Design a protein around this ligand. Structure first.
Ligand code: HEM
Ligand SMILES: Cc1ccccc1Cl
Length: 432
């Protein structure tokens, strides 16, 4: 019944707690082994049930009528992305009493979530993505040509891994190549709200609500950009994902409000590339630690999907979403009360020893690989099949050209409790 001990709680709740994976994952592990379902009571944050166990992540996510993302009928009464209390108070001042700062899927509950998700559900299905595979492969090959041309010493993140997923999504989305640097800069602002090296110049960086001010400022910039794109595609439809979303109409034949398109566009323009980049960079880091794995996958390219799945499990770049209990609920001998918030720790679920043998080992021979890196339930990642296709295609084209990866300098992670992973991975590559 006791609260989680303060230093374990802070390690997971505070963005600074995620600056180094070793103490973070040790805190995950301490909870899974000693307090698998406890409440973190960190100063400046609401109390949070920390959902650390794989089974409990599934139990919560499969019950959206009990555990809401946005607050149920009181729309925007829960922030699905953990802000501090001061930040949620900033947002309630900005919006007028609620936290629904985007109309994007994470903020929605059923049935609204189901209606909006159905706009793009079919586009994202694996069979409907096959038509993009050749364009993806041409983009991978061009990115690899530049890697070979630039020589063996580089930052595998900022000088390689970031560009391929961004070009893929912007090409499919319909954003011109000259706008990629702007989308990359706003993505860094968006996922860097609490990172000391990613602060915007137009917000008070040291204010208690700084991250929330940066989140809002970045969204306003994305809205200004996407307003032009929505109007453009409504006026002149094209065969791109921007058009599918911009022209979408509800069951009465009326356009969805423009903010619904902007929500899709923010998600596609940020998570649509950043997570794939993180997973690719994490894969390279693991191939440096496990050179026998690189040798094996060059020997059998049919192992590439297994390598992708184990990179997703280990990297798990999307760290959490929050839920709120709409009624009292008992789980794992604990009494969650109506109104209590939950933090879904996907990275911890992915290390649960009840599910994965030697969960901290990089083992591509987990078959099936039961990872929960894409979450679960009706909110399960819509982009999962595009991410797995892009990572497969890039590795099929890249690994033949790599004999060895060496990490030659200190890796750096984005300091976030939300969408993280590497921002820097200095390497020495040996080309074949
Ligand atoms: C390695 C790549 C990725 C990982 C690990 C990842 C992971 C996740 C996770 C854990 C969630 C939350 C699921 C939940 O609430 O249960 C999520 C949601 C989502 N992701 Fe992905 N993601 C990846 C790539 C992508 C891509 C490529 C796109 C789009 C092109 C995308 C779009 C979304 C959207 C729109 C949501 C919100 C879904 C909803 O709330 O219904 N993701 N992702
Ligand atoms: C903002 C965001 C982050 C991760 C996955 C999806 C979305 Cl929409």
């Amino acid at each position: 019944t006791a609260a989680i001990p303060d230093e374990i709680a802070r390690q997971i709740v505070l963005p600074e707690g995620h600056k180094d994976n070793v103490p973070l994952f040790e805190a995950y592990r301490w909870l899974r082994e000693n307090q698998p379902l406890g409440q973190a009571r960190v100063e400046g944050y609401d109390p949070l049930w920390l959902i650390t166990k794989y089974a409990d992540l599934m139990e919560v996510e499969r019950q959206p009528q009990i555990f809401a993302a946005g607050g149920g009928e009181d729309k925007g009464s829960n922030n699905p992305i953990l802000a501090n209390q001061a930040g949620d108070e900033f947002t309630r001042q900005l919006l007028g009493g609620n936290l629904r700062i985007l109309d994007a899927l994470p903020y929605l509950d059923q049935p609204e979530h189901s209606v909006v998700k159905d706009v793009a559900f079919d586009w994202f299905r694996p069979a409907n993505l096959k038509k993009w595979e050749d364009r993806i492969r041409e983009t991978a090959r061009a990115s690899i040509d530049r890697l070979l041309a630039g020589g063996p010493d580089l930052d595998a993140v900022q000088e390689f891994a970031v560009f391929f997923p961004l070009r893929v999504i912007m090409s499919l989305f319909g954003v011109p190549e000259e706008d990629e640097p702007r989308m990359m800069a706003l993505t860094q602002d968006f996922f860097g709200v609490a990172d000391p090296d990613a602060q915007r110049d137009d917000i008070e960086a040291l204010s208690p609500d700084a991250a929330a001010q940066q989140w809002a400022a970045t969204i306003a910039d994305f809205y200004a950009y996407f307003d032009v794109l929505v109007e453009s595609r409504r006026a002149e439809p094209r065969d791109d994902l921007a058009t599918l979303i911009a022209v979408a109409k509800d069951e009465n034949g009326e356009y969805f409000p423009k903010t619904f398109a902007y929500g899709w566009f923010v998600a596609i323009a940020t998570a649509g590339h950043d997570t794939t980049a993180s997973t690719l960079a994490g894969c390279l880091q693991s191939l440096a630690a496990h050179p026998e794995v690189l040798d094996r996958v060059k020997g059998d390219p049919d192992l590439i999907p297994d390598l992708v799945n184990e990179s997703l499990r280990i990297v798990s770049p999307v760290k959490h979403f929050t839920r709120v209990a709409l009624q009292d609920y008992e789980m794992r001998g604990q009494k969650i009360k109506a109104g209590d918030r939950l933090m879904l720790l996907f990275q911890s679920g992915n290390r649960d020893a009840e599910v994965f043998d030697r969960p901290d080992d990089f083992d591509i021979d987990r078959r099936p690989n039961k990872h929960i890196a894409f979450g679960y339930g009706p909110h399960m990642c819509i982009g999962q099949h595009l991410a797995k296709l892009e990572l497969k295609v890039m590795l099929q084209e890249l690994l033949p050209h790599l004999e060895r990866v060496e990490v030659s300098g200190e890796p750096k992670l984005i300091q976030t409790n939300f969408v993280g992973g590497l921002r820097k991975l200095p390497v020495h590559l040996t080309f074949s």
